[PDB]
Design an enzyme around this catalytic site. Sequence first.
Site, PDB file in Angstrom:
ATOM      1  N   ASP A  39       0.802  -1.227   0.000  1.00 54.88           N
ATOM      2  CA  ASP A  39       0.000   0.000   0.000  1.00 54.88           C
ATOM      3  C   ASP A  39       0.834   1.275   0.000  1.00 54.88           C
ATOM      4  OD1 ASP A  39      -2.755  -1.032   0.090  1.00 54.88           O
ATOM      5  OD2 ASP A  39      -2.140  -1.872   2.034  1.00 54.88           O
TER       6      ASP A  39
ATOM      7  N   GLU B 134     -11.609   6.105   5.372  1.00 53.89           N
ATOM      8  CA  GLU B 134     -11.929   6.181   3.943  1.00 53.89           C
ATOM      9  C   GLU B 134     -13.334   6.716   3.653  1.00 53.89           C
ATOM     10  OE1 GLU B 134     -11.033   2.133   2.865  1.00 53.89           O
ATOM     11  OE2 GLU B 134      -8.895   2.588   2.580  1.00 53.89           O
TER      12      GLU B 134
ATOM     13  N   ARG C 290     -16.022   3.720   6.438  1.00 54.33           N
ATOM     14  CA  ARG C 290     -15.694   2.319   6.661  1.00 54.33           C
ATOM     15  C   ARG C 290     -15.266   2.160   8.122  1.00 54.33           C
ATOM     16  NH1 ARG C 290     -10.531  -0.543   3.459  1.00 54.33           N
ATOM     17  NH2 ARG C 290     -10.059  -2.132   5.043  1.00 54.33           N
TER      18      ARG C 290
ATOM     19  N   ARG D 210     -14.289  -9.087  -2.186  1.00 58.44           N
ATOM     20  CA  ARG D 210     -14.470  -7.914  -3.031  1.00 58.44           C
ATOM     21  C   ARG D 210     -14.805  -8.336  -4.458  1.00 58.44           C
ATOM     22  NH1 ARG D 210      -9.447  -4.235  -0.543  1.00 58.44           N
ATOM     23  NH2 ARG D 210     -10.489  -3.886   1.481  1.00 58.44           N
TER      24      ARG D 210
ATOM     25  N   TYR E   3     -12.709  -0.994  -4.098  1.00 61.12           N
ATOM     26  CA  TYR E   3     -13.207   0.249  -3.523  1.00 61.12           C
ATOM     27  C   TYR E   3     -14.299   0.878  -4.377  1.00 61.12           C
ATOM     28  CZ  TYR E   3      -9.610   0.608   0.141  1.00 61.12           C
ATOM     29  OH  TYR E   3      -8.838   0.403   1.258  1.00 61.12           O
TER      30      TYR E   3
END
Lengths: 388, 388, 388, 388
Positions: B70, B196, B211, B290, B325
């Site tokens: 990240d 976020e 979130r 996801r 996302y």
Amino acid sequence: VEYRNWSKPQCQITGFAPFSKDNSIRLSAGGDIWVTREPYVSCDPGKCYQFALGQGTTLDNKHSNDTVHDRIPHRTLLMNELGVPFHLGTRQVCIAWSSSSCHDGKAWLHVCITGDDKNATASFIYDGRLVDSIGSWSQNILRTQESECVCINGTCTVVMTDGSASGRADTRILFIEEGKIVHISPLSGSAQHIEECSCYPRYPGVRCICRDNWKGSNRPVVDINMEDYSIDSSYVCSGLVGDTPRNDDSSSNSNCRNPNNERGTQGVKGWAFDNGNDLWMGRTISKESRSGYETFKVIGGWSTPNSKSQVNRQVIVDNNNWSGYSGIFSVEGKSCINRCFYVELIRGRPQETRVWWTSNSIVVFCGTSGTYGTGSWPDGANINFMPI
Amino acid sequence: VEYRNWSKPQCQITGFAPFSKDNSIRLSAGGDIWVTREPYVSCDPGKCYQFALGQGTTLDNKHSNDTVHDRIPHRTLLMNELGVPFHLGTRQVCIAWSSSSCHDGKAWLHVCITGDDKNATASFIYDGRLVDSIGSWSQNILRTQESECVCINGTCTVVMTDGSASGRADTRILFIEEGKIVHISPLSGSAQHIEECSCYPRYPGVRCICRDNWKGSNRPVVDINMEDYSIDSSYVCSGLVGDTPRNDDSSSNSNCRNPNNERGTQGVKGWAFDNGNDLWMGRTISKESRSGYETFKVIGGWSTPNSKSQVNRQVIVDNNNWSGYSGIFSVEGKSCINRCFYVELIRGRPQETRVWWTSNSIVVFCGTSGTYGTGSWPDGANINFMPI
Amino acid sequence: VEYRNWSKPQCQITGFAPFSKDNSIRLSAGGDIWVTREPYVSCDPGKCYQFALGQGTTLDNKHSNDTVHDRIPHRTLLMNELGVPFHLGTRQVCIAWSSSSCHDGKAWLHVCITGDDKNATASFIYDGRLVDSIGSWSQNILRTQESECVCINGTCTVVMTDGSASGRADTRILFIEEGKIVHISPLSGSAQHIEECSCYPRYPGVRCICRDNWKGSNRPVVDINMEDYSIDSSYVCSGLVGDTPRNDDSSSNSNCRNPNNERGTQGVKGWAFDNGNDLWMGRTISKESRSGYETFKVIGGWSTPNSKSQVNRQVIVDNNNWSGYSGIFSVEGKSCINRCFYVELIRGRPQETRVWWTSNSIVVFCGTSGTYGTGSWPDGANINFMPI
Amino acid sequence: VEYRNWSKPQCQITGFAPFSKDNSIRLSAGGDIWVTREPYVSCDPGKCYQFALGQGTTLDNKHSNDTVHDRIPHRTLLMNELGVPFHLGTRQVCIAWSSSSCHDGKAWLHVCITGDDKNATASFIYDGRLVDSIGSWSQNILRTQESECVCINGTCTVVMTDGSASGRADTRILFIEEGKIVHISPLSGSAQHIEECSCYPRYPGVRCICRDNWKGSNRPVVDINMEDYSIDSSYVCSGLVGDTPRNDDSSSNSNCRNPNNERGTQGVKGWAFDNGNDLWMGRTISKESRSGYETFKVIGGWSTPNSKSQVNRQVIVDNNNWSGYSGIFSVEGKSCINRCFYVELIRGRPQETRVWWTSNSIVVFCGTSGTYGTGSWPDGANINFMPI
Ligand SMILES: *[C@@H]1O[C@H](CO)[C@@H](O[C@@H]2O[C@H](CO)[C@@H](O[C@@H]3O[C@H](CO)[C@@H](O)[C@H](O[C@H]4O[C@H](CO)[C@@H](O)[C@H](O)[C@@H]4O)[C@@H]3O)[C@H](O)[C@H]2NC(C)=O)[C@H](O)[C@H]1NC(C)=O
Ligand SMILES: *[C@@H]1O[C@H](CO)[C@@H](O[C@@H]2O[C@H](CO)[C@@H](O[C@@H]3O[C@H](CO)[C@@H](O)[C@H](O[C@H]4O[C@H](CO)[C@@H](O)[C@H](O)[C@@H]4O)[C@@H]3O)[C@H](O)[C@H]2NC(C)=O)[C@H](O)[C@H]1NC(C)=O
Ligand SMILES: *[C@@H]1O[C@H](CO)[C@@H](O[C@@H]2O[C@H](CO)[C@@H](O[C@@H]3O[C@H](CO)[C@@H](O)[C@H](O[C@H]4O[C@H](CO)[C@@H](O)[C@H](O)[C@@H]4O)[C@@H]3O)[C@H](O)[C@H]2NC(C)=O)[C@H](O)[C@H]1NC(C)=O
Ligand SMILES: *[C@@H]1O[C@H](CO)[C@@H](O[C@@H]2O[C@H](CO)[C@@H](O[C@@H]3O[C@H](CO)[C@@H](O)[C@H](O[C@H]4O[C@H](CO)[C@@H](O)[C@H](O)[C@@H]4O)[C@@H]3O)[C@H](O)[C@H]2NC(C)=O)[C@H](O)[C@H]1NC(C)=O
Ligand SMILES: CCC(CC)O[C@@H]1C=C(C(=O)O)C[C@H](N)[C@H]1NC(C)=O
Ligand SMILES: CCC(CC)O[C@@H]1C=C(C(=O)O)C[C@H](N)[C@H]1NC(C)=O
Ligand SMILES: CCC(CC)O[C@@H]1C=C(C(=O)O)C[C@H](N)[C@H]1NC(C)=O
Ligand SMILES: CCC(CC)O[C@@H]1C=C(C(=O)O)C[C@H](N)[C@H]1NC(C)=O
Ligand SMILES: *[C@@H]1O[C@H](CO)[C@@H](O)[C@H](O)[C@H]1NC(C)=O
Ligand SMILES: *[C@@H]1O[C@H](CO)[C@@H](O)[C@H](O)[C@H]1NC(C)=O
Ligand SMILES: *[C@@H]1O[C@H](CO)[C@@H](O)[C@H](O)[C@H]1NC(C)=O
Ligand SMILES: *[C@@H]1O[C@H](CO)[C@@H](O)[C@H](O)[C@H]1NC(C)=O
Ligand SMILES: [Ca+2]
Ligand SMILES: [Ca+2]
Ligand SMILES: [Ca+2]
Ligand SMILES: [Ca+2]
């Protein structure tokens, strides 16, 4: 559109915050990206641009071979918006193996030097047209700042040198109005050698911190009076000196007036600026190599000879990574003029011989009155992943 | 140009219509395209832009390897016109491994966070210059929205968190005028963890759906009062909850006030918005991964605790395809403010191990008062065709 | 900026002169270029743009395989200045496997259709925002012009069809003001099947020459009254018919009113326009295949049933080279409105099976009142030099 | 915006300074770059553009093979900002295997010739639209300047030839207003063959220095009266003649009136301009081949027959390197009109047979009233590094 005067106070800063990074070398391993060196940044009133000297080739290209050389006819000045890497749609602004650029509030001036070592030509391009030129005056590599020039009320000034890189040379300060040279002042004062000046507006004048390639590891200062064209010069007072090579901090000296004769020969382009009695400066972390990059404030660094009390240090590039040239640029805010700097991150030869090319990426920081943390923002390319 | 106030009613929508898709991954197999994640969309008064966090490399490039991570110093915020994929002429706006951007009617603000995990720096860049910065307040990954901030009458607000991703953290709401931080409010109310945030103007204030990475699979709400800087927070009432992971629809709960303690740890960035007593929301189709993406209206979803009657469902990405996302953006029309959203379509690791990289494309939909049909608009790349 | 009215006479023309060519396929053999089909041209008041439907991939890319298919979720509308080939910096304007675009004097309208065959969605994007949408009315491939729509005094009109491609379908004419559908008129008159209309302003109305895919090799005409939204339709009078397939010139017929029932099924997008009693038209040179392209004037082609006296023939593409769709666009001059056309030059499958992709380049001609010579301007790629 | 009149005196120059270089061939070995020839430069009132005739292909592309040929239907006129190499985002302005372009102060005119050798079409495109066209008058390669046309008070003039390249041909001078041909004058005076004129404003008229391909190695002059459309012609007086091939300097002659019949057949596009009685001119250094490039002033070169005293010579490209076409362009300064020129640097066939293509780069110099040094600025590509 009005001429810039830079007639605001300098922003009071606590250090520097991250501003831009172009990742040029990492991208060059999967994309067509220009081979460059001698980058810099300059901004028009609305936005910033990155500049560099191309080597007339992309990196993944057999012509990238042996691009360590400083001067070939194919070098051109590249100009993109800051953070747009030098891709194949990049405009080559002029022919140049040495340059300086600046915006006077109305238009861009570019100072572009090319041709034979012993008989070079400087072209002055303003608002998209060639307005003037001057030939070499000492027949020994006519050369200039490799960072932004500075304009006040429609007069732009730029520092140029011609002559020995290892002995007394002939340095002159040009004053240029809409691309036309209107006055040339010889260097005066106590600075004994001047290369690659990093200049900034300090209304009503311009101040430059440069590179002494002959006898000083302390950085020379050139002060330019924009009203009467008079010149003064000296050396940065700080006992924590800014050049590379240089002595260890425990045995480095400056008296503000003379080159220190401490590993004085050779050098690297760099910068510093004054705030009252104090000095903000950057330098390589290594004393002998273009490796790492750090900034700090020296208490009394501007006014007190041999001052060595530093504070507010930041690592920009850690000492396990290559740096290079660095320079200042100035950005007008609502109520003050801010100081920013870029660092050239040189990859390839001579330090990294797996590859045959030499190129660079950049990282860019700006002064802040706020707070910040720590990090390290090196080039980031894996030399083993690169085309050779 | 005048400052945005967003002082129009919210458009009354029947669902969403297709707006944009960039096909980034498909193109990356035959072109030089940036490796990215954490994309979003934000529009100035005339046109929309796509943003994402680069990984300092293109996809067909050995540096793409292990871009699942990240935070590296080479991450920069990319900005193109919406629908222009991230090619090599893309501008890197700032250095950032977490970001938020927004236009106040006159100029762009970018909030860019980079540096060491335990001591990060957030830079605030407005109208092309660095105006402010703040350092980490909890020494544990200072971080922000990964979608657009919101400005009313020249004051922009952004939500930031510093501290644990799996426990009580320190969330603060910043108020920024022309890039200058003018006020900072701590989180208040009943939300127990905030990451976020997907925020939108709800004149006279700003509302965010975020979130909870700690105890909630129900999404927290943060309400920002732009007049006095006061903050409130709670959870979305809907019993059809928006986070991933979450319980199935028959065993999921929300009481509007507390985290539900139902598969609460971890999460994914997402969005929702109120319309009277009802709620428009998106979520992944899979309750654990996801995968897929769906939108629907929950009747009483804003006002009634544990409401589970939905209507006007649309599949955006079918459940055989990877999502990621998602976030909201708002677009001013002639007589109302419309709500739109983007979906990040993550390809590569950890889910697809043929390749060593992790990247994404995007698909984008906008609220409509008209009618529409059905479809599925996934990333579309064949993993077997990709450079590894 | 003022709304276009197109309230000038049609330029009197003697034929057509070369205007643009993009060389897309030749370039695709040494460059990253989009796979496309269904191109067209439309101009804002200052300059022209080329459009096409991307296939979500470049040509030199494994995803180019089997791009013969008309509808996938990854198709997007591409938009560049005319003559800028579809390189990786091309903007994808919307998601679309069928489209139409036009500028009303103030801003661009895009009509973009995507999603499931039996339940598609048309999005209406105006001045950079989604303003409206409509769903399928016959659950059988909602579809539109694949060329420019036309706007008069801020009302844009576009022709759409939903239903059978080989039998009676449901064709409707939409009227759109700043992206908002304000009226929908059903097709009326004697045209029995309408596809892929090529429309042009004929002040105070709009006139379209389309494709009958069911019973006619003669081209249908749709006349749109912009004042009261009334619709009329018929067939081009010319006995030299414009569709492909069609009969030989010696056995082809049109009575101006009915489909001719001569190789009527299937077809190709094309165009024609009236000048008094005469007709200017283009068509493929081959009667059965999309090969070659010719233009000519038919004396009495507009007013006299079954007229076959042609004059002023020009070869645009010789019959040893592939053509494809063609369409009209109109360009406002100082004192008259000119008519121009583009020809799609389809390469690859199904006709050329060495390669697995299907794509196109374009060539573009404009009406002239001057003189001209002869030539042939085909795609020009060597199929044997292409990536497969 | 007002029409250009060019009603300022010519700048009094001492020679020329470096202005631009594009490094096209070097870059083509590591990037997708257009194959071109017949480049030129022309500037609008703010900035300069480079033009060239593409060959419908990039260099690293199998379609580059046998691009030595002058006329194929895929040739298009390319236009970028000066210094932006011809990358894949370059706009193809029109279809052309011969061209001329110029800006009249309000908009660009492009004259684009394409089609069959015996029946070509010239299109006239102004302000983004086709305004006029003319067909071949002698059925033998209608052709034009390959450098900028010239406009005064809204009337642009361009020189065109049709007929034999090795004998008497039919040369005409066109006068064009907003893209519309308003008058055509036949060549008059004593010039016996005219090709590829390099024209410049000399208020109140236009003056052209051209190429005699039949009997002259001295360059013809065409003088264009913009008031009454009358035409005069002669030859440059200078005994140092400008064409290639030519006799050596000791045996070359010109009488100002007739072709010299000294190695007269064939030629190369070039330029010169008057300053009082003197002449500034460029030519290849080699008298037989397109190798090297030099400029100098000939004392009495304009007024005195057979004058051979030169001064202020500069080498632009040394005689170990390939040159090619050259042409003039004019740039309006604050108080005078400056003269600049470009040199086409041809690489590949027929001179270099390792490769199968023929292409070029450019170097560009502008008149200066200042001083300058020496150098050589050749193409710089290593033929052995190139794709073949
Ligand atoms: C989080 O980030 C902040 C901001 O970067 C950081 O605070 C900074 O720490 C440095 C290092 O301590 C401070 O700079 C020092 O200041 C003292 C004077 O007080 C000097 O003596 C130091 O100079 C020397 O030590 C250096 C090595 O640290 C040597 O290189 C040098 O030659 C001298 O021997 C140095 O200048 C700086 O002032 C603060 N900045 C602020 C605003 O407080 C903090 O430490 C970071 N914390 C963590 C855990 O990362
Ligand atoms: C053509 O397209 C239109 C528009 O997309 C489509 O109409 C839509 O159909 C869906 C599905 O029936 C509707 O959404 C549903 O609404 C009912 C309430 O009436 C809800 O109960 C549904 O929720 C559930 O069922 C879902 C599966 O469909 C589950 O995922 C969920 O967990 C619940 O169990 C759902 O929200 C929607 O309202 C209409 N939209 C409109 C505007 O009418 C139509 O079906 C398509 N045509 C064809 C032939 O399919
Ligand atoms: C140089 O270029 C000019 C301009 O393009 C060109 O003149 C054109 O020639 C064509 C062909 O003769 C003319 O068009 C014809 O007009 C006659 C009526 O007079 C028609 O009968 C022709 O139709 C038929 O013949 C066609 C084949 O030519 C068939 O395809 C068709 O089915 C019919 O049988 C055709 O329409 C045209 O009018 C002129 N244009 C002008 C402005 O004069 C000239 O021929 C060229 N010369 C050379 C040597 O290339
Ligand atoms: C540093 O650069 C400057 C500027 O370029 C340069 O000065 C220039 O030198 C040239 C060469 O001497 C001069 O041009 C010559 O002028 C004389 C008249 O005085 C002519 O006779 C020359 O013509 C011939 O000689 C040529 C070879 O040089 C032949 O090619 C030709 O056919 C004739 O035989 C020639 O035109 C020029 O005038 C100066 N320019 C200025 C502004 O002074 C200087 O020489 C360079 N420094 C060094 C050390 O070389
Ligand atoms: C020419 C002497 C000059 C200062 C010592 O050398 C510079 C040093 C360089 C260096 O130390 O890396 C690189 C510069 N590109 C070079 N400048 C020029 C004009 O060639
Ligand atoms: C640090 C906690 C934070 C939210 C849980 O992790 C995020 C989760 C991510 C994720 O769940 O995919 C990816 C984000 N790039 C990461 N953010 C940062 C700044 O590293
Ligand atoms: C869907 C029926 C329609 C008209 C027959 O077919 C078109 C014909 C095509 C064709 O004949 O080549 C290609 C078009 N892309 C296709 N249109 C759509 C929307 O898929
Ligand atoms: C047709 C005669 C003409 C001038 C002699 O030939 C030119 C010479 C050329 C040359 O001598 O290199 C190249 C030009 N591309 C060609 N022009 C055209 C239009 O083909
Ligand atoms: C670079 O040039 C040197 C010197 O000719 C040569 O030895 C070397 O092989 C070249 N490198 C590459 C990668 O071609
Ligand atoms: C990526 O890195 C890993 C770890 O070093 C290595 O094993 C793998 O081979 C790399 N992938 C590629 C495609 O080179
Ligand atoms: C295209 O796909 C087909 C079907 O899978 C396959 O047979 C063919 O090899 C593919 N072509 C290429 C060039 O990979
Ligand atoms: C170019 O074409 C010629 C003639 O067909 C051929 O002999 C040659 O091999 C080609 N060159 C390349 C590099 O393919
Ligand atoms: Ca030194
Ligand atoms: Ca959670
Ligand atoms: Ca048909
Ligand atoms: Ca000759």
